[PDB]
A paper describes a structure:
The malaria merozoite protein [name] ([name]) is critical for RBC invasion and is one of the most promising blood-stage vaccine candidates. We determined the X-ray crystal structures of [name] and insertion fusion immunogens 2 and 3 to resolutions of 1.80 Å, 1.85 Å, and 2.10 Å, respectively.
The [name] immunogen is a circular permutation of [name] that contains a Gly/Ser linker (GGGGS × 4) between the original N- and C- termini. This new [name] C-terminus is immediately adjacent to the N-terminal helix of bound [name]. Some of the residues deleted in [name] (360-YEKIKEGFK-368) comprise a helix in [name], which is replaced by the N-terminal helix of [name] (4-QQAKDIGAG-12). This design approach ensures that the [name] sequence (3-TQQAKDIGAGPVASCFTTRMSPPQQICLNSVVNTALS-39) could be appended without a linker to create [name]. The [name] structure was most similar to the [name]-[name] complex, with no major structural reorganization observed and a Cα root mean square deviation (RMSD) of 0.299 over 245 C-alpha residues.
Numbering used by the authors: 3 to 53, 77 to 364
Write the structure that this text describes.
């Protein structure tokens, strides 16, 4: 459990729109200060959208350690036993708005299906390859029809439903049904993408290769809030069904995070200042600095299972469903062995 952040990190920022300063800090805020120059943001928040302690109830959703409970930039907060081997999995309770993965020196978008059949590893992305019946990608309307006879899921919010759908595929080696894949929901196309690869960062020169001529070598990649990801939500298996009320999403206009002390909201007494031209660029920096469950580079050298420690998952070609009716679903083609 050495790598788990449990949500601790530089998760919050006060963006001064007039001085173009992103004031980043790593303690939970406990009140808000009215100030027309400011917008209050968190690493989980959408990067653009804006809206004896009397603040306790209102500020609960900014207590990231309590309401999310895991990393943000890299979320690998739980372990799942499969056939005697313990794999790392995303486990945060809130959706991460605007997060995606950039594959370095690559044309491949990360929601492209993982390489299968005759494809080289670097030709494919992170998403589930086609299955029969087709499980991913699936649109919202398709998901509600798929689950139309399941009372407990059919009416879930679209993000919670995408999370539960991604969790509806049990690898056939996983007899205790512990392993649940993460997912990305694209609000533009209203599509749920189950992610076959649960890793989110691989940047060590000893463990990845950025050369495009070595197309079966492991590629390098990192999480980011790129402008092209603004409609995505990165979702672990644990996304809660009431995230809309308990998790952050919109940024707070005309508001500065503060700390409640002796009946008054005081300024955060020490912040780390980064320049940022607009709110999106501040949110991107807060995310870059936020809680991470990634092993530090020196820790990846000291382990004998570097791939597992960054989230490498089990080899699975056929699956069974968790929710009724029980059915078997197989990939149309097996994933590239290089994985």
């Amino acid at each position: 459990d050495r790598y788990k952040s449990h949500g601790k990190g530089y998760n919050w920022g006060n963006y001064n729109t007039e001085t173009q300063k992103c004031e980043i800090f790593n303690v939970k805020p406990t009140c808000l200060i009215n100030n027309a120059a400011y917008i209050a943001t968190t690493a989980l928040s959408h990067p653009i959208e804006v809206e004896g302690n009397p603040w306790t109830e209102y500020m609960a959703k900014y207590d990231i350690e309590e309401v999310h409970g895991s990393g943000i930039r890299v979320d690998l907060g739980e372990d799942a036993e499969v056939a005697g081997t313990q794999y790392r999995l995303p486990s945060g309770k809130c959706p991460v708005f605007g997060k995606g993965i950039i594959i370095e020196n690559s044309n491949t978008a990360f929601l492209t299906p993982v390489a299968t059949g005759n494809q080289y590893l670097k030709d494919g992305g992170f998403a589930f390859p086609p299955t029969e019946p087709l499980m991913s990608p699936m649109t919202l309307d398709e998901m509600r029809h798929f689950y139309k006879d399941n009372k407990y899921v059919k009416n879930l919010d679209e993000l919670t439903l995408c999370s539960r759908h991604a969790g509806n595929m049990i690898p056939d080696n996983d007899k205790n049904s512990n392993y649940k894949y993460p997912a990305v929901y694209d609000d533009k196309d209203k599509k749920c993408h189950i992610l076959y690869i649960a890793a989110q960062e691989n940047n060590g020169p000893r463990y990845c290769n950025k050369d495009e001529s070595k197309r079966n070598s492991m590629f390098c990649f990192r999480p980011a809030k790129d402008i092209s990801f603004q409609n995505y939500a990165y979702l672990s298996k644990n996304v809660v069904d009431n995230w809309e009320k308990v998790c952050p999403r919109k940024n707070l206009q005309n508001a500065k995070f503060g700390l409640w002390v002796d009946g008054n909201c005081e300024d955060i007494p020490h912040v780390n200042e980064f320049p940022a031209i607009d709110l999106f660029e501040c949110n991107k920096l807060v995310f870059e600095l936020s809680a991470s469950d990634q092993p530090k580079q020196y820790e990846q050298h000291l382990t004998t299972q570097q791939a597992k420690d960054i989230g490498a998952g089990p080899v699975a070609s056929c699956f069974t469903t968790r929710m009724s009716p029980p059915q078997q679903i197989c990939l149309n083609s097996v994933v590239n062995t290089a994985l």
